[PDB]
Ligand binder design. Structure first.
Ligand SMILES: [Ca+2]
Length: 421
């Protein structure tokens, strides 16, 4: 509810069936070997009765579903014991633009303001064989059944928590079918299921929706963590952005685990921009008025776990403790130009990566304008701006230090699974 909302894509056999062909051809090559995850960040999350702001353009689809709600810290939950970690279930709505591609993360399609209605948590034993219904303006519009999902609730909790710890109050959306129904301004969309209070939301022209949902500020880091893919010219028509779940974050001089039996885990030094004022539809020219200042991240990746579904996916990029980030923020006024700073990485004192923000493809103002054009940025949100060339493998015992000129120096130590236990 106020927890992180994860969700699974491609979990309904109808979509798997529909996409079977596409999944054998470029750019997928092969069907998903593993669950395809996404996140509905805090700007999306609304309760019953709250409006879904409609972006004009622009075709929008309801996505009635149900979400498991975590009742206690879930790390490596065993399938057979899942119910003990689940407080209950809640009706939800993965509101989305069309699912035309599953290759790149679907941020414009799924992370718009108000795009995740979620209702009341109900303490049921399971949601087996549950028909989830959608009504529009009070008429029946759609129905589907959780028996047609590939992974059930227990399996989803076990699969995600295997690498990403969930906290009490976090949720998992169980998935949606291929076929969806379209909503438009003026519609009232209602989700219903036996055993739950109906969830209802009106769809309103976004130009008519008021101030934007705000949140209490908490010490950094606390906010949506956006991250760029390929953003250094060093050696894309539009930026590749994906989100990282907050349990990936860890502080200075901590440890990060390298999984057993993989070939390649690499650091990624990055300049991180932190938002200081709520921002929507901001021009490049005013973007910097919304920046609080800068910090540093080490955006690790396990290259082995990469797949071609919402790439780079959560099993690579939202690993528990695989994103060291400094807790200090350097105010923008202490940094004349963020587009002229050196980044470096050292492993055991050997310089392995060096670059400059002069090589950013997409500038800080471009990125702020680009994201705020389709979603609300709030104070404490962070934008990891990418990394220059110079990646390499790091192994247990290694000390990896990333540094951005004038912003900070961030230390981390790799350990084995055996050591971290
Ligand atoms: Ca990165």
């Amino acid at each position: 509810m106020k927890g992180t909302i994860f969700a699974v894509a491609l979990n309904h056999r109808s979509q798997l069936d529909a996409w079977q062909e596409a999944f054998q051809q470029s750019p997928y090559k092969a069907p998903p070997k593993t669950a395809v995850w996404f996140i509905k960040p805090r700007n999306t999350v609304i309760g019953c009765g709250e409006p879904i702001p409609f972006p004009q353009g622009e075709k929008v689809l309801s996505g009635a579903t149900v979400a498991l709600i975590v009742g206690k810290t879930a790390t490596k939950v065993r399938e057979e014991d899942a119910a003990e970690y689940i407080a209950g279930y809640a009706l939800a709505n993965d509101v989305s633009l069309p699912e035309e591609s599953f290759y790149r993360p679907a941020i414009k399609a799924k992370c718009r303001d108000g795009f995740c209605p979620i209702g009341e948590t109900v303490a049921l034993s399971n949601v087996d064989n549950l028909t989830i219904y959608t009504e529009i303006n009070g008429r029946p519009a759609d129905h589907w059944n959780t028996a047609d999902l590939q992974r059930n609730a227990a399996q989803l909790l076990s699969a995600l928590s295997e690498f990403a710890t969930l906290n009490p109050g976090d949720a998992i959306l169980l998935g949606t079918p291929q076929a969806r129904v379209e909503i438009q301004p003026g519609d009232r969309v209602r989700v219903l299921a036996e055993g739950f209070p109906p969830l209802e939301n009106p769809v309103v022209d976004e130009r008519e929706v008021t101030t934007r949902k705000s949140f209490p500020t908490l010490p950094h880091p606390h906010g949506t963590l956006f991250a760029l893919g390929l953003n250094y010219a060093d050696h894309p028509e539009e930026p590749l952005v994906f989100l990282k779940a907050p349990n990936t974050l860890t502080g200075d001089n901590q440890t990060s685990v390298r999984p057993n039996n993989i070939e390649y885990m690499h650091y990624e030094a990055e300049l991180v921009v932190v938002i200081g004022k709520q921002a929507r539809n901001v021009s490049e020219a005013d973007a910097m008025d919304y920046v609080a200042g800068y910090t540093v991240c080490n955006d690790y990746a396990i290259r082995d776990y990469l797949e071609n579904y919402y790439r780079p996916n959560l099993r690579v990029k939202s690993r528990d403790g695989l994103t060291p980030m400094l807790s200090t923020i350097v105010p923008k006024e202490a940094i004349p130009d963020p587009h002229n700073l050196t980044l470096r990485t050292f492993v055991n004192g050997e310089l392995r990566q060096q670059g400059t923000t002069a090589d950013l493809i997409f500038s800080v103002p471009f990125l702020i304008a680009y994201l705020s054009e389709f979603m609300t940025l709030n104070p404490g949100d962070m934008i990891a701006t990418g990394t220059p060339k110079g990646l390499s493998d790091v192994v247990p015992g290694d000390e990896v230090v990333v540094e951005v000129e004038g912003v900070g120096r961030l230390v981390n130590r790799i350990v084995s699974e055996e050591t971290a236990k």
